[model samples]
Target chain A: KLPGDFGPPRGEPIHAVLTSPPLVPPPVNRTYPAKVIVELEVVEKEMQISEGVSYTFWTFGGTVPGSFIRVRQGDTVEFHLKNHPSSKMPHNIDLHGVTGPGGGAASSFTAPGHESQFTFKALNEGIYVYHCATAPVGMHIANGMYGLILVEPPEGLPKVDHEYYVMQGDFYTAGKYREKGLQPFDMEKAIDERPSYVLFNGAEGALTGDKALHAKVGETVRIFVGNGGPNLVSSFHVIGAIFDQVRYEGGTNVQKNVQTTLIPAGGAAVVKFTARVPGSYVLVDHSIFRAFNKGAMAILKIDGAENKLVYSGKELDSVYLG
Target chain B: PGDFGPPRGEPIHAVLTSPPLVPPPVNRTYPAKVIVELEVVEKEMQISEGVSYTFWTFGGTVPGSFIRVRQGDTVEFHLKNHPSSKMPHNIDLHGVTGPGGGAASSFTAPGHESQFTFKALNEGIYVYHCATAPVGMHIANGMYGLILVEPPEGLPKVDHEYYVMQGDFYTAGKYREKGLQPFDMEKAIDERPSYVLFNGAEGALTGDKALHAKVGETVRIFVGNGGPNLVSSFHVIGAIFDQVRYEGGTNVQKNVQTTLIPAGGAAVVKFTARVPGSYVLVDHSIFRAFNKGAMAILKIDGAENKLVYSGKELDSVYLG
Candidate 1:
């Protein structure tokens, strides 16, 4: 059964809230111990990669990156995995954060029209990746059977103005770049390690234009970034902003004043910073061209009054002859 | 012209030792004079089976050489260009904190030698490449290398260490075309390279030359992307990086899967073999690894652990 607090927020929504992952997990008054139960179904469907280009994605919970699971350090998670009867292949999960053999992959393999169950104790405090680990594991993960689980420290973390979940991944299609209609998964390309589309949160423009992630100036924001890469590594960087604190690789250790943090495929990082200037800050993979060409960029729209002390507007543009 | 030290009254002919491409010393630190010499040569080399291309290189190899030094050390670089070279050349080092990263100071003409000195102020892995006019073309021609400025405290001990760099070459001829191929300036400008390879050549570190290690041993690799254009999505199948020094920074990130090495950037990745097998290294762009020769292998030999990874298949059945 899905927990009451699961899925999107209920009741009135705030403008400060964005379409990215939730800013925070449902507030926990106190913690004893939790047996967090989550249920996900395998969904196969065709979705757009760009405007007219479509890809048949075999996903969990009907999304490229299934869903985010937030829990305390010591919580035990009873994950219920189900494969839709219409599916044709078997599936399972291998959590990068889990300590057991195959990270629960062995315990969670299920065929079509079947279900599997497994339990794992969140022994470590960090963000971890959980992906389908069936035979031809890379193919399964590339088809979008992946998500993030945040094992927050037992004592929990300091309150931030907002928090979001974002992941980067690559998709390989039989057709060339920008090819329209449904494209088959190209095994040749996957084996060769080339991708047609490198995406964020499932599709292009998922977090851009009017759909951009929103925040207010002077508010501290924390982004839990993951790379489901199946290939590409994410040079997670926010243009025009510096990360004041980066929980390096989502671990407990913190690094300050980071220009860019690299998150490997199947790895995660937590970056927190305050938005001082009011403008659109672009989130990109500093591989440079990938952001501009292959659709791995997002917009973080910060709206508020600009403080002159922190950063003054351009004062002069006088020409000088030397 | 700058001040010449005791070792240099005139341009001396110093036969250089080739840098080791495998297993560097784990930990040590001292202030010593490090002399790095590089020669620019243009020659025809086989790119793939029966395919030949004219390669302009440093030290006569695709990825130049792997240079190692301790943090806080002084490095004197001597760049020499063969008189037969077609154009001028220079080097820009990412490790050096100086004007143009030593590019402006070491622009040597053909048959000439240029020298400069820089202090290894920070510890981390970095890339060095020719920054001549048409920088991308120079890099695409195979003029790049890796330099490791070991931290003052040194790196953690590993059983094996290897050097590898990913690069793409733009050839005037089609990929795998058998014959001498020229440089494709059009492809270089279009950012579409015909050959994406590892260590400057196809199969350079594959097959018999594949890196090897014992089971249960820890390993570190210094990987750089000399991409004149393409960015490498560096990944190793069947293995995970236990520690990654991203962009060669002093801080370490742990438990990485695939690391992204950008064009002109570098990263140091370490992992321990929990199960013995051949792990294939790929750019993870997918097709390049399989089709374009952007692949290598780490052959780990020893007893296998079923507990960590059950290599044996557990279940298989028919849909009928």
Candidate 2:
């Protein structure tokens, strides 16, 4: 009886395990569809965006980009959202994967000290962006309340050596970039689409030094890049390496040998490349000025013996007389 | 027409069209030589209803012209600069597999002409623009267009096709300031533009100039971004792309709501006019659509289908 071929949940309900920024939850291993429950609590905290600049950020699951959620296609997702008692406003979620009304925003509205729950059937398999869809949606998103969710295909994807999560956000504050003390969100600047800071992973250190993405030469790396922009489209590019394949806008088909791909606002892209030569590669929004002036830059550190056959160190360097 | 049928090896002069117009499909079964000639023109044109700016263009149109050829065809391109032009110019077609994409070979002085030849090495919608020394400034002043290299078998038939290119302009004055606006180097360098337009003007593809297709007609749009600075998040409101040659690459993506067109890149999208209404096209970066003017219109004239889209079925105050 029931709902025929795609009926009620078959297996015991499982609570989804979520990861934070620059980290992806393990790929789903279950072979069949089931009920998956995910819980995210909204937290408001003051965090450093740059070296000396701080801004109060409203986030999901206590991180700037909230948490990463992964589930299999055809799974029933029961989402739970809780707003911490310290918050002053009500919050809701609008997932791009939810093929329903308001991206499930209307059904999942939670006030401070309260919780809300909603359910959606995952009908598509791709990377999706979920963000707070409260009334002041732009401001909420500007304050850092967005993350990525992956709906793995039933057969799953081809094996890869490394998978990482990276997202970009544009922030506008009352003070100039790197100004000391806690700066307030500038409504005018936000309206004008002038962001003082365009950062990767919310913080400058999230993808820097020891926190930077690491890999070995010849390893296949897949990056799930999301743009949580209340404004601005990111020309996502890695300096030293070319993407062997790019899942444009996080779609099923992939484009080969892309130097750079555009990530739209509230959009995501999955790019895969092999670390052929060992070197530190810089990941940037190829808008050029955004990477050079703004903080829209990250590092991908590779450690291995350099393959000179692939690249000559500097065949001949000398001053030339013109 | 002088040449009625296609024969192998013999060359055919291409029919080129300016903005919003596309040349006919390539119906040849075998590869042949194609000749494309474009003359650069520098003239003051209306930026909007009451605004003006001096634009450097190919074929005298802001986006130059649309050139269509077969995949294996050899294209002989001639770049001609009008004697009245103040600066030298060149051309770079992205589909070529050569140095500077034929830039140096086609560079010409204001009163001279240059020519080069290359095979249509790739089957995709490609972008071509002026690649002069001040490349960014040259591109900023509207010096680009699209060239379609159809697969050997050719593209699937469609009822209509159109050419549209998005551009971001940095003018000395704010948006819509009267009189001829000078190019602002600082804003162009900083990636800030006073105007983001389609086909070089605010309403170039809207009002009386909007694209049109009848109901149940399948339409294909060849979209391009001749950007010196910004990328475009191209989208059409009230419609979904049935199939998109994402980034003008070989593969196609289905049922996409929005697609990103890279600067110096191109894409081909197809969709049907399901019902009768006006479909608005925008950059989808939001602000650029509303504030900076990145928008166009596709008007469908026919009966509406309430089953597909019920406009304002109910409008009431919700107390729940």
lDDT of each candidate versus the true structure: 0.74, 0.83
| Residue pairs with backbone overlap in model 1 | A192-B286, A192-B287, A192-B290, A193-B285, A193-B286, A193-B287, A194-B285, A194-B286, A194-B287
TM-score, cand. 1: 0.68
Model 2: per-residue lDDT, tens digit, A175-261? 988888899999778756899989898886669888899999889999999888878888899999899998888777888999999
- In angstroms, give how far residue A185 of model 1 lies from its true place: 7.0
lDDT of 1 by residue, A1-322 (tens): 1111122222332221112242345434334456666666777788887888888787877776776767765555666677887787988877665534456675678788777776655555667777887767677878888887776665677888888878888887899878788888887666545778777877888788866888999899998888877767677899999999987656566889999987767677889999889988988999877888888888899999988898798989999998
Q: Highest TM-score among the candidates is held by which one?
A: 1
lDDT of 2 by residue, B69-163 (tens): 98878888889899999999999999888998999798899999999998877788999999997899999999999999888888999999999
